[PDB]
């Protein structure tokens, strides 16, 4: 069987290559159905030169030679922890494909990787150490901040949550949060014992510095924002306050299974996650990809989803 | 009763003031016997202008109106967690003075605060999480690095310890360590799961960056070096590796009691700590203080101890 792989050959330039696919291999052959563009894929799109791009998606099983998943089973695809999804067929190990419930909105299950990242970070805090009596802080009014707020509220129901961001636009989407602040306007006496840093790039430095100042002593901080650079950190205060800083990144197949199991538990999560769904595009040519990527560039809030009909 | 307080009134300038002391107060009146100059006191000596300086010391109880400690009991003095010891009498709460065994070298028990700092840092790692099967790294071939190596070896006997420093002079004092390295010459494939950052100032940044690189994934790092400044930190790697960074500073009275209880357990500690004892000075005038402080400035390795005979 022949597989068409849609690779990025140059910034703002896609081209199709071919490779052979063994139906009777120990993998599970999957056709991607919906996928979502990620910031990391946008870095490459604009600026290992030939490669496939998307790595968050869900699809249907068209073949499973080992006979584990029946044909047509809708499954969320886990990528490799250290080749993308823009192709006619994706081959996964049987532990790298998580079955979904029979009826579910796939267009928003596409960005389940962000939820796994968020849930992984949350589980970095010992579950036995955190109750509904703690108080959480979240820097970042974007997708990670939103998903993290959702997860904390659903699974720490009686807890208190504060969100710190930069724009009224993005912060209005946080209604289930106990209170919402600007980084420009933080009141004195505000306190919390656990905090999540969901801001990237150069802004992560400012985020980290603020949560160092405002966090309660002996508090813990989970880092999520990628800097791809060094950031100045005030270590004197981490010492004086006894702060524990935990960095957490790539998630595991367990995080995907747990997130799926949570979709089953609180379908409220799927409905709240829908508010992250920005613009959607049906992809049937290459032109549809260039247009879709230009749109995710111009996108203010939320994720861009692609409907794979190649 | 009249107390003479020897304060620093100007950089390189001491002067004596007076204040009244109530023998019959709820405190315990203590005459300091031996004390040791600390880097923090040297910052002020050279460059809250009027204040007393030394904060690590041991002395004898001359009065205890509440009747808890008998007169002459030799006790290690705990300072206040957020006024110094260069005075004829020091008043402590009954929980701020730890009794010592009857026969012990006081000239080296003077710098028990460094041991409490080190032990506090070690206990930041959950004791149930660390066995004699772990492998420790220590940046810094100075006093904190030496004390930390001592404590780890005594209480994690079958564990492995590596020390990283800058000078052959200081690193030769580490013989009980499994192996000793330069920061200039670190071999590939070197690995460890828990690490201690015992370097201060601008050098802490380099230390932190190195232990970020070489530490095993999911490893923990205890920060001890004070920077009094920001330091660039590579957060991308803390994320990719899942590193947990714990800052730990001022110790508690529990740390002093535990350190004392350890002196009782392994008197080997007191003998190894003696190798830190640099130059000793009998202080009977102000001139003896200026000379002593100039000497702790010129000191390469170890602590400077003062014999209080004012």
What would the CATH number be for the domain defined by B2-113+252-308? 3.90.180.10
DSSP label at residue A100: -
CA distance A145 to A148: 5
To the question of whether residue B55 is assigned a binding role by annotation, the answer is yes
DSSP string, A222-258: EE----SSEEEEEHHHHHHHT-EEEE-----HHHHHH
- Residue A225 Cα distances to A61, B121, B251, B255, B287, angstroms: 33, 27, 32, 36, 56
CA distance B231 to B138: 19
Buried b or exposed e, range B111-138, using 16+ CB within 10 angstroms: bbbbbbbbbbbbbbbeeeebeeebbbbb
Radius of gyration of chain A (CA): 20
* Contact (CB, 8 A) for A90 and A30: yes
The nearest CA of chain A is from the CA of B308 a distance in Å of 31
B2-113+252-308 matches B116-247 in fold: no
Contact B233 A230 (CB under 8 A): yes
For B205, other C-beta atoms within 10 Å of its C-beta total 21
CA distance B34 to B309: 9
In this complex, the residue of B230, B242, B248 whose CB is nearest that of residue A248 is B242
Can you read off the two tokens belonging to residue B305?
């101890």
Chain A residues inside the 8 Å CB shell of B231:
232-233, 235
DSSP label at residue A191: -
Contact A238 B227 (CB under 8 A): no
Chain A residues inside the 8 Å CB shell of B241:
247
For A131, other C-beta atoms within 10 Å of its C-beta total 10
Chain B residues inside the 8 Å CB shell of A248:
239, 242
Beta-strand relationship, A179-182 and A277-283: unpaired
Strands (E), chain A: 2-10, 13-20, 28-36, 57-64, 74-77, 90-92, 97-99, 135-139, 160-165, 179-182, 194-197, 220-223, 230-234, 244-247, 277-283, 303-308
Q: Which residues contact A16 (CB under 8 A, 6 or more apart)?
A: A4, A5, A6, A7, A286
Is residue A128 within 8 angstroms of chain B, CB to CB? no
CA distance B92 to B197: 32
DSSP label at residue A63: E
Can you read off the two tokens belonging to residue B297?
């400035």
Chain B residues inside the 8 Å CB shell of A236:
226-229
Beta-strand relationship, A28-36 and A90-92: antiparallel
What would the CATH number be for the domain defined by A114-247? 3.40.50.720
Q: Residues in chain A, how many?
A: 310
Chain B residues inside the 8 Å CB shell of A243:
246-247
A67, A72, A42, A46: which is closest to A56 by C-alpha? A42
- Spell out the domain ranges in chain B: 2-113+252-308, 116-247
B49, B48, B74, B51: which is closest to B61 by C-alpha? B74
Can you read off the two tokens belonging to residue A268?
């409220």
In this complex, the residue of A225, A233, A239 whose CB is nearest that of residue B226 is A239
* Contact (CB, 8 A) for A249 and B218: no
Beta-strand relationship, A220-223 and B220-223: unpaired
B239, B220, B193: which is closest to A120 by C-alpha? B239
Max CA-CA distance within chain B?
Answer: 65
Can you read off the two tokens belonging to residue A162?
């504060």
Superfamily the domain B116-247 falls into: NAD(P)-binding Rossmann-like Domain (3.40.50.720)
Contact B232 A233 (CB under 8 A): yes
Q: Give the SS3 label for residue A87.
A: strand
Contact B244 A242 (CB under 8 A): no
| Architecture of domain A2-112+251-308 in this structure | Alpha-Beta Complex (3.90)
- Residue B66 Cα distances to B3, B25, B26, B69, B188, angstroms: 20, 8, 6, 8, 61
In this complex, the residue of B204, B242, B243 whose CB is nearest that of residue A235 is B204
Phi, psi of A140 (to 5 degrees): 115, 115
For A252, other C-beta atoms within 10 Å of its C-beta total 12
Is residue B226 within 8 angstroms of chain A, CB to CB? yes
DSSP string, chain B: -EEEEEEEEETTEEEEEEEE--TTSSSEEEEEEEEE--HHHHHHHH---SB-----EEEEEEEETTS-S-TT-EEEEP------S-BS-EEE-TTSEEE--SS--HHHHTTHHHHHHHHHHHHHS-GGG--TTSEEEEE-SSHHHHHHHHHHHHHSTTSEEEEEES-HHHHTT--SSSEEEESS---TT---SEEEE---TTHHHHHHHHHHHHSPTT-EEEE----SSEEEEEHHHHHHHT-EEEE-----HHHHHHHHHHHHH-THHHHHHGGGEEEEEEESSSHHHHHHHHHHHH--SSEEEEEE--
Beta-strand relationship, B194-197 and B220-223: parallel
Backbone break loci in chain B, preceding residues, C–N > 2.5 A: 47, 82
Q: Give the SS3 label for residue A126.
A: coil
* Contact (CB, 8 A) for B54 and B111: no
Contact A236 B229 (CB under 8 A): yes
To the question of whether residue A94 is assigned a binding role by annotation, the answer is no
CA distance B180 to B168: 10
Contact A239 B246 (CB under 8 A): no
B16, B235, B213, B205: which is closest to A206 by C-alpha? B235
Buried b or exposed e, range A24-47, using 16+ CB within 10 angstroms: eeebbbbebbbbbbbeebeeebee
CB pairs under 8 A between A and B: 98
Which residues make beta-bridge pairs with B18?
B4
- Which value in Å is the resolution of this experimental model? 3.2
* Contact (CB, 8 A) for A274 and A140: no
In this complex, the residue of B231, B237, B240 whose CB is nearest that of residue A233 is B231
CA distance B57 to B77: 6
CA distance B77 to B60: 10
Is residue A242 within 8 angstroms of chain B, CB to CB? yes
Q: Which of B120, B198, B203, B247 to mutate to test the interface with A (most CBs of A within 10 A)?
A: B247
Per the listing, tokens 């405002």 go with A214
To the question of whether residue B113 is assigned a binding role by annotation, the answer is yes
CA distance B114 to A16: 65
CA distance B162 to B178: 6
Max CA-CA distance within chain A?
Answer: 65
Contact A235 B242 (CB under 8 A): no
Q: Which residues contact A128 (CB under 8 A, 6 or more apart)?
A: none
Task: Annotate A147-172 with three-state secondary structure.
Answer: HHHHHHHHHCCCCEEEEEECCHHHHC
Element (H, E) at A42: helix A39-46
Which residues make beta-bridge pairs with A188?
none
CA distance B205 to B223: 11
Vertex A244 angle, CA A130 and A262, to 5°: 35
Q: Which residues contact B225 (CB under 8 A, 6 or more apart)?
A: A235, B140, B144, B197, B198, B199, B200, B201, B203, B204, B207
* Contact (CB, 8 A) for A50 and A9: yes
B9, B87, B80: which is closest to B44 by C-alpha? B9
> For A85-142, where are the alpha helices, taking DSSP H only?
106-109, 112-124
CA distance A19 to A91: 12
Is residue B242 within 8 angstroms of chain A, CB to CB? yes
Vertex A137 angle, CA A133 and A140, to 5°: 150
- Residue B173 Cα distances to A309, B114, B164, B176, B220, angstroms: 70, 17, 12, 9, 26
* Contact (CB, 8 A) for B1 and B21: yes
Contact A236 B228 (CB under 8 A): yes
């Amino acid at each position: 069987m022949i597989n068409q792989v849609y690779q990025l050959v140059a910034p703002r330039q896609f081209e199709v290559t071919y490779n052979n696919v063994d139906i009777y291999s120990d993998y599970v052959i999957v056709r991607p159905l919906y996928m979502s563009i990620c910031a990391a894929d946008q870095r490459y799109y604009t600026g290992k030169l030939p490669m496939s791009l998307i790595h968050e998606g869900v699809g249907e099983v068209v073949f499973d030679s080992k006979g584990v998943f029946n044909k047509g089973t809708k499954v969320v695809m886990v990528p490799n922890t250290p080749d993308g999804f823009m192709q006619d067929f994706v081959l996964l190990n049987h532990d790298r494909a998580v079955p979904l419930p029979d009826d579910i909105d796939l267009s928003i299950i596409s960005y389940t990787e962000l939820v796994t990242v968020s849930l992984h970070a949350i589980r970095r805090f010992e579950k036995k150490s955190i109750s509904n009596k703690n108080t959480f802080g979240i820097w970042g009014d974007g997708n990670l901040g939103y998903i993290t707020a959702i997860l904390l509220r659903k699974l720490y129901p009686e807890s208190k949550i504060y969100v710190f961001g930069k724009t009224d636009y993005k912060l209005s989407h946080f209604s289930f949060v106990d209170d919402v602040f600007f980084i420009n306007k933080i009141p004195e006496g505000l306190t919390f014992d656990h905090a999540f840093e969901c801001v990237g790039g150069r802004g992560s430095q400012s985020a980290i510095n603020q949560m160092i100042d405002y966090i309660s002593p002996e508090g813990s901080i989970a880092l999520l924002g990628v800097s791809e650079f060094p950031v100045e950190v005030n270590t004197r205060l981490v010492l004086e306050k006894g702060l524990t800083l935990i960095g957490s990144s790539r998630s595991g197949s367990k995080d995907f299974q747990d997130v799926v199991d949570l979709y089953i538990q609180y379908p409220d999560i799927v409905d709240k996650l829908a508010l992250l769904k920005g613009q959607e595009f049906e992809i049937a040519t290459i032109n549809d990809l260039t247009e879709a990527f230009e749109a995710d560039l111009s996108t203010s809030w939320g994720k861009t989803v692609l409907k794979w009909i190649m």
